[PDB]
Amino acid sequence: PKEMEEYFEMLQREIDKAYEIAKKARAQGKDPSLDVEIPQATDMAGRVESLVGPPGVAKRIRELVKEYGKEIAALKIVDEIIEGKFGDLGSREKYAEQAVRTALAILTEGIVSAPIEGIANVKIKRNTWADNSEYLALYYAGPIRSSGGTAQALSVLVGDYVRRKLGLDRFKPSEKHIERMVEEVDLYHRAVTRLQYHPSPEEVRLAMRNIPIEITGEATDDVEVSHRDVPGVETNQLRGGAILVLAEGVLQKAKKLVKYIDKMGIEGWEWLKEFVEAKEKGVDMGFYYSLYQKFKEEPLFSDPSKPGGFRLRYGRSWGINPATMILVGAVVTPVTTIEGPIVKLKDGSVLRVDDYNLALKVREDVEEILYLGDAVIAFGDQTLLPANYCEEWWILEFVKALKEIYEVHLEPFTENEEESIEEASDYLEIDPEFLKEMLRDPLRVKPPVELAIHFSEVLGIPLHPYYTLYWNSVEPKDVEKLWRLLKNYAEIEWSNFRGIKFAKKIVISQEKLGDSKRTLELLGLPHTVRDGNVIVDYPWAAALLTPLGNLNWEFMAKPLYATIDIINENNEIKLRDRGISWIGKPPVQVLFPIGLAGGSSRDIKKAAEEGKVAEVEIAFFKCPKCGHVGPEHLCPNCGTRKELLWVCPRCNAEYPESQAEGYNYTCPKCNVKLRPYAKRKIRPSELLNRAMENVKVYGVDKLKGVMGMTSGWKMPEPLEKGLLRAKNDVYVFKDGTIRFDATDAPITHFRPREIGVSVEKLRELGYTHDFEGKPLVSEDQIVELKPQDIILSKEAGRYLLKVAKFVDDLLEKFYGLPRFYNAEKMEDLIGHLVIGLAPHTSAGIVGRIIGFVDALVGYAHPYFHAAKRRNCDGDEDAVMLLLDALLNFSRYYLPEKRGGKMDAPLVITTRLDPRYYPLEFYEATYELKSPKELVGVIERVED
Ligand SMILES: [Zn+2]
Ligand SMILES: [Zn+2]
């Protein structure tokens, strides 16, 4: 649709405006990179290319996914990479690395960080202790944990496919290789991290003897092992990344992994299928009174007489009348054919409200909601509730009676044969066009009460449910009382249709009726109060008196009988129950290490004020122009971009980036690897005073940094960024972003009034029509939510306003750029963009703020925060302002070792591109079955 395409284009314009500002800011060289560190993508193909490449892959992925699906496509890409279709990548090791990252990113839809943060390296090595044959090794980093077990297990299968395509042999561990792993898993689980799945020593041996690649990595934890100096294992400490992949990946997710091996047809994994099966192999009573009794056996201020909730309605696939939306995981959808609420007005009048227009008219006069309305819930879903009598059930009984009595064959919810409609019309004394419409749409086309009664009389069918009151909501003793008051004090006007005598109008004094007025309300009887009288007009006078036999038989309360049981025992016209079932800190301002110098609160301002010196592991930069050394990116003397100094951890020799690159990040006269940082003496007073001068902000209360950096780089964030955060009362996350940790609920529809946004604002946002396709002109209209449009809580809005003020201060004071947001109130953020990031994911989704709710839980479209991610059991989301993330996020701030629940936005997604049950079903709900038993019932009926 052109409306959706225009929406996606509007978002691109807004995204591009944010990237142009951030590119200008980053070009200045005050940050770890001269570029914006968050690439954007349209789709999973684009996510793959943007994250790990190779260039031109996204185009191939689209073609391959369209032909073969995601799983097979990943293998086809590995083949093409190795064949050189994406250019000469150089060494077999560079081809292996590219094919590993790309294929794993394809399989994980570019949603997780395993291809970037999880795999540090891919190496070709030899089984020197064995046959000296070549094999593939994957070097896993501790942050692999952030991607979940499924991603970890798939990296192993990808590694195996890649090594086979490169013609490499299998990894053939020595007995010392296997035992070191057994030891490592034990020591890791015991004192580092408790494994989600803790394998037995023999399970570790099984995995180790059968995984065809080496699951390895650099040391993640300073914990010495006893199986030391193993050939090919370049550490004597714990390889946490590897341990996680083996236990929490391959063994924990072994059942999910075998499904992938099956979809992909990879051989040599029978040992894993055998592991999965081994884990598996080791006085009389009334009908309704009886039904309500069995039904029980299977808020304190609330009215006991009033049943709580919506009237259950089984759907063949949630569904709510627009009038109940105005007057009152699951997603609500407007359905105009089902029933709305039953309301009592201030004047005492009782009314059914089944349309949007009537709901608006009575809204100001509603005194009580007697009945909430229907809720259409799909049977697809374990105790199953008895079905409420409804038009769907009644129409089936109506057509069964025509077949049984007259041999006329008719079907509901379809076009019928003219001759059959005519035959039945002649027997029923009705209009063929009326019958056609009632059969086609029984929820919309109801007969008048006299014809409903005539249908029951002729066909022996229960009274139509539209004319069935909530008889069983009332105790039989109260119907008995009501009966006497009507018999003695009511003035009744009668009518006669084809020999059927029925009530046309009931007039009873409010005085004479008394307490029984409450019985009429509980019955859901529509009535009016005028001139001290209760008046029951047509068709409701017959709905009341026809089940009571026009007061020709006396209603008497009987023990162990429900009201409908008494009616059904004594009345010619029979009923079914229309209402039996009812439903319903933070502690950091700047990423800057202060050690113990800022006391217990890591206060940089206190450290600088007390003239304290800090000894912290921190990265230093050398100026090539003058020679200045310090923790900043730009030179404070000549303003030229400074070069990172690499340090040898032994001789403490300093080597600038280019010199370190020549020496392959290894000291030229020590065989030990260089570090981008060292333990250094820091003088916060000179650093903070310069930062204060730069941004012209002095009056900060406190400035909370970190005790130490958890990144591999230990490259601090500029203090200027912290000063502006403290000024704006905002706090930073580990990666340089500011996040609001929210809980959101899925929605598909909204009303402007409910989100506190005007019709004109929404028209400017591109909303043209309501759910019915009618022009959007009222704040009360029900509107369909656009896929990336989100409603935040007022709590989110209150914090985000502060973030917008920090971004604007940063742009102007630190970057010398114009302000962007200019927000004073949270409503100024409507139309502005955010990044939504779910737990265990590294692909954020672009969202547009369209409104705010007074509640703690915000709203988003089901596509924005999928039920699948919500089943990876995080209803929590993190929200960042788009521009805050583009300016302030850096991969150089990512944790080196710890992989938690919350990951980073490694990429952002800019586009989110997208009859009836048989009679036997309804009858079977009365015999209290489960849906397993009932699906069998429906499947057998559909021969
Ligand atoms: Zn300089
Ligand atoms: Zn050295």
Numbering used by the authors: 4 to 285, 308 to 323, 339 to 357, 365 to 375, 393 to 445, 451 to 653, 668 to 997, 1006 to 1034
Paper excerpt:
PolD exists in all Archaea, except Crenarchaea, and is a replicative polymerase responsible for initiating DNA synthesis at both leading and lagging strands5678. It is composed of a large catalytic subunit (DP2) and a smaller subunit with 3′–5′ proofreading exonuclease activity (DP1)5. To help resolve the uncertainty concerning the evolutionary origins of D-family DNAP, we determined the crystal structures of two large fragments of both DP1 and DP2 subunits of the Pyrococcus abyssi PolD. While the interaction between the two subunits is essential for the full activity of PolD71413, both DP1 and DP2 constructs described here are capable of digesting mispaired 3′–5′ nucleotides and of extending a DNA primer in a templated manner, respectively. Both DP1 and DP2 crystal structures were determined individually by experimental phasing and refined at final resolutions of 2.5 and 2.2 Å, respectively.
The DP2 construct covers amino acids 1–1,050 from DP2 DNAP subunit, leaving out a C-terminal domain (CTD; 1,051–1,270) dedicated to interaction with DP1 (refs 13, 14). The DP2 structure reveals an extended molecule with overall dimensions of 55 × 60 × 110 Å3 and four domains: the N-terminal domain (NTD; residues 1–285), the central domain (residues 308–667), the catalytic domain (residues 668–996) and a fragment of the CTD (residues 997–1,039). The most prominent feature of the DP2 architecture is the extensive interaction between the NTD and catalytic domain, which results in a wide interfacial crevice that hosts the DNAP active site, formed by two double-psi β-barrels (DPBBs). Unexpectedly, PolD DP2 and ‘two-barrel' RNA polymerases (RNAPs) share a conserved architecture in their active sites. The peptide chain connecting the fifth (β31) and the sixth (β32) β-strands of the barrel forms a right-handed α-helix followed by a 10-residue-long loop, which constitutes the most conserved sequence motif of DP2. This motif comprises two invariant aspartic residues (D961 and D963), which were previously shown to be catalytically critical for PolD DNAP activity. The DPBB is preceded by a helical region composed of three α-helices (α24, α26–27) and a tandem repeat of two zinc modules, named Zn-I and Zn-II. In both cases, Zn2+ are tetrahedrally coordinated by two pairs of cysteines located in turns, but apart from that the two zinc-binding modules bear no structural relationship to each other. In particular, the peptide chains connecting the NTD to the central domain (residues 286–307), strands β7 to β8 (residues 358–364), strands β8 to β9 (residues 376–392) and strand β18 to the catalytic domain (residues 654–668) were not visible in the electron density. The 50 residues of the CTD present in our construct are partly disordered, except for two helices α32 and α33 (residues 1,011–1,039), which bind next to the interface between the central and catalytic domains through interactions with the DPPB-1 and helix α32.
